């Protein structure tokens, strides 16, 4: 068994990936929440949403979709690994 | 990169501190998941992703 610092190295790898996925996903959620409040404001005044705004928003949604697919599996392996 | 550095950072922790980190990261996944789902409900009923028709 490969180890690093006394821990199984494949466990630390999955935790590394867990931490990194969550940090990116946090950034994406922050961008979505502000985009919603802008859009909420625009919609309240019957003002159009720019095409560029829609594109950026849709890009974040699809990126989140992939992060969540990676988060799944990684979360499973981390759970699987917690023998303790 | 900053990824191998994180891997080394984790391996240098005590067992108790690694476990707290795993628990914190799992809790963070759940909290972010609540945030994410709320903004997906908000965006749906603001129709941000309807295609232009006019």
């Amino acid at each position: 068994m490969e180890t690093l610092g006394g821990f199984p190295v494949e466990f630390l790898i999955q935790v590394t990936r867990l931490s990194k996925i969550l940090m990116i996903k946090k950034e994406h959620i922050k961008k979505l929440r502000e985009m919603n409040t802008e859009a909420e404001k625009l919609k309240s005044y019957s003002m159009p949403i720019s095409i560029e705004f829609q594109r950026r928003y849709a890009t974040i949604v699809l990126e989140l979709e992939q992060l969540n697919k990676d988060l799944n599996k990684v979360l499973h392996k981390v759970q699987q690994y917690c023998y303790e | 990169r900053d990824d191998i550095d994180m891997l080394k950072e984790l391996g240098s922790l005590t067992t108790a501190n690694l476990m707290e980190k795993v628990r914190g990261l799992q809790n963070l996944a759940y909290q972010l998941g609540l945030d994410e789902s709320r903004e997906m409900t908000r965006g749906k009923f603001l129709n941000i992703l309807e295609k232009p028709k006019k």
Binding site: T59, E65 | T41, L49, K51
Partner: peptide, 28 residues
Amino acid sequence: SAWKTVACGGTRDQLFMQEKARQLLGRL
């Protein structure tokens, strides 16, 4: 079991929004 629904972005409106995003961008 459903704790993953939240943790991994699987709620009904998120799957809906992902569908709209694919359509808006022209992706399968």
